Amino acid sequence: QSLGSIAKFSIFSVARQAGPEPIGWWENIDYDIIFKYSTSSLLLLVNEVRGATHRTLNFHPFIADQYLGIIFLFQIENTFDASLLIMTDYQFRNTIYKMHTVLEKILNEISDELINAFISEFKDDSEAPITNREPFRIILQRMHKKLKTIPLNL
Amino acid sequence: QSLGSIAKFSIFSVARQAGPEPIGWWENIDYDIIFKYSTSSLLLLVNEVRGATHRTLNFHPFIADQYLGIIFLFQIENTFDASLLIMTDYQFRNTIYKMHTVLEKILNEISDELINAFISEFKDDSEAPITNREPFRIILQRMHKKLKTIPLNL
Ligand SMILES: [Mg+2]
């Protein structure tokens, strides 16, 4: 088992003028599900005076669904709050906690790629509808390929 | 350094018919501060279909305040959602993650004492005003004495 084998899906979300919005996700997941966790991922920030001013890894249990959410909170400028979420089954929570250092490493690396792809794609209008999700799926697919080379520290 | 030396304060809270309420805390902390984190501790459950059906440890960053909240969610019957929160400075987050097993151990042990003290004290009226906080302060003070014997795994 690897981090990638327990990563059920991942989501890149940005809070634009209409609130949290899924930009891309991986792999094939019903949009109603994506929208739910995309929204939860960024409303963990409801009462943060300045959003995600520190790139914050937050492990968030989704008790009812038996999921643990690995949520990386960050910002995009040239300011949008944004999140990168990896979701895993709740039973693995203890291994995920032990593995926080490598998770923070890869989440930073992938977040940088997603930031650059967002600024590149939304040059003209930062509020445009997301008519091409594939640059973001490609980046998230790459994430998962790299996660699958990290064996579970357990 | 021990877990107890980085534990800035702790709170035992119960969500009764009027919502989240601090029952006791340790040591001396302005009530407006206690009420803030007491409330946040239990509204992490806003969108949980059945509250804290699984005793859930949740590490929650308070980015703006530079705090990490160690939040144990549990229930009281003879059903109230309840929380036990230990707050630490955000810089220690990485050590806290490594130490999840012993934290879950002691949080379970202390939560059992607080549950028994709550059922004992609110026998007649479960919605009564909290006119005697000291049984709960004593339990939380005991927590902190035990935390101070756990050296930081780092
Ligand atoms: Mg959390």
Side-chain angles (χ1 to χ4, degrees):
Chain A
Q1 269 172 318
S2 66
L3 281 183
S5 69
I6 73 174
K8 293 168 155 332
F9 55 88
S10 61
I11 315 167
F12 169 45
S13 310
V14 179
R16 310 196 288 177
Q17 78 193 344
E21 253 182 86
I23 312 297
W25 58 89
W26 186 258
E27 192 168 0
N28 307 318
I29 307 279
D30 288 347
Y31 188 85
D32 46 300
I33 300 295
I34 293 300
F35 186 79
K36 182 183 168 181
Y37 294 120
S38 171
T39 296
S40 304
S41 89
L42 283 163
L43 301 171
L44 289 182
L45 300 174
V46 288
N47 282 330
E48 295 284 357
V49 302
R50 286 153 31 108
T53 39
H54 303 86
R55 283 194 185 189
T56 288
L57 171 62
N58 183 336
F59 304 113
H60 185 77
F62 293 96
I63 294 130
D65 316 281
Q66 285 297 271
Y67 282 161
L68 173 72
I70 308 166
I71 306 169
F72 197 62
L73 300 153
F74 60 97
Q75 291 180 150
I76 317 181
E77 302 106 337
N78 133 251
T79 304
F80 282 145
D81 278 337
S83 70
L84 172 56
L85 178 150
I86 303 166
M87 180 104 72
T88 72
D89 169 300
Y90 185 52
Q91 83 163 103
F92 294 114
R93 62 207 186 265
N94 303 314
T95 302
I96 293 302
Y97 294 140
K98 291 173 31 31
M99 286 195 74
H100 69 272
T101 292
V102 72
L103 282 164
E104 212 161 339
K105 190 168 175 182
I106 191 152
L107 289 163
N108 264 293
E109 151 176 357
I110 296 297
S111 291
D112 286 354
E113 290 179 32
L114 295 163
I115 280 162
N116 289 330
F118 191 88
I119 311 165
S120 162
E121 290 282 317
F122 294 88
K123 275 161 205 148
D124 310 324
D125 182 8
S126 76
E127 293 281 353
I130 305 114
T131 58
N132 189 11
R133 302 187 186 270
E134 298 285 314
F136 310 97
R137 291 182 65 82
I138 288 164
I139 290 168
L140 291 173
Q141 172 185 42
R142 178 183 301 131
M143 187 146 77
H144 285 250
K145 295 190 226 103
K146 303 191 165 172
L147 289 172
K148 287 171 65 190
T149 71
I150 308 168
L152 283 191
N153 199 342
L154 224 347
Chain B
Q1 269 172 318
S2 66
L3 281 183
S5 69
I6 73 174
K8 293 168 155 332
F9 55 88
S10 61
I11 315 167
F12 169 45
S13 310
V14 179
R16 310 196 288 177
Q17 78 193 344
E21 253 182 86
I23 312 297
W25 58 89
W26 186 258
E27 192 168 0
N28 307 318
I29 307 279
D30 288 347
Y31 188 85
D32 46 300
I33 300 295
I34 293 300
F35 186 79
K36 182 183 168 181
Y37 294 120
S38 171
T39 296
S40 304
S41 89
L42 283 163
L43 301 171
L44 289 182
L45 300 174
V46 288
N47 282 330
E48 295 284 357
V49 302
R50 286 153 31 108
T53 39
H54 303 86
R55 283 194 185 189
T56 288
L57 171 62
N58 183 336
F59 304 113
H60 185 77
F62 293 96
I63 294 130
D65 316 281
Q66 285 297 271
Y67 282 161
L68 173 72
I70 308 166
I71 306 169
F72 197 62
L73 300 153
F74 60 97
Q75 291 180 150
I76 317 181
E77 302 106 337
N78 133 251
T79 304
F80 282 145
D81 278 337
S83 70
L84 172 56
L85 178 150
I86 303 166
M87 180 104 72
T88 72
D89 169 300
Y90 185 52
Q91 83 163 103
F92 294 114
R93 62 207 186 265
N94 303 314
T95 302
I96 293 302
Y97 294 140
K98 291 173 31 31
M99 286 195 74
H100 69 272
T101 292
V102 72
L103 282 164
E104 212 161 339
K105 190 168 175 182
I106 191 152
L107 289 163
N108 264 293
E109 151 176 357
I110 296 297
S111 291
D112 286 354
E113 290 179 32
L114 295 163
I115 280 162
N116 289 330
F118 191 88
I119 311 165
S120 162
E121 290 282 317
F122 294 88
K123 275 161 205 148
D124 310 324
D125 182 8
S126 76
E127 293 281 353
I130 305 114
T131 58
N132 189 11
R133 302 187 186 270
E134 298 285 314
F136 310 97
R137 291 182 65 82
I138 288 164
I139 290 168
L140 291 173
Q141 172 185 42
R142 178 183 301 131
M143 187 146 77
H144 285 250
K145 295 190 226 103
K146 303 191 165 172
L147 289 172
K148 287 171 65 190
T149 71
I150 308 168
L152 283 191
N153 199 342
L154 224 347

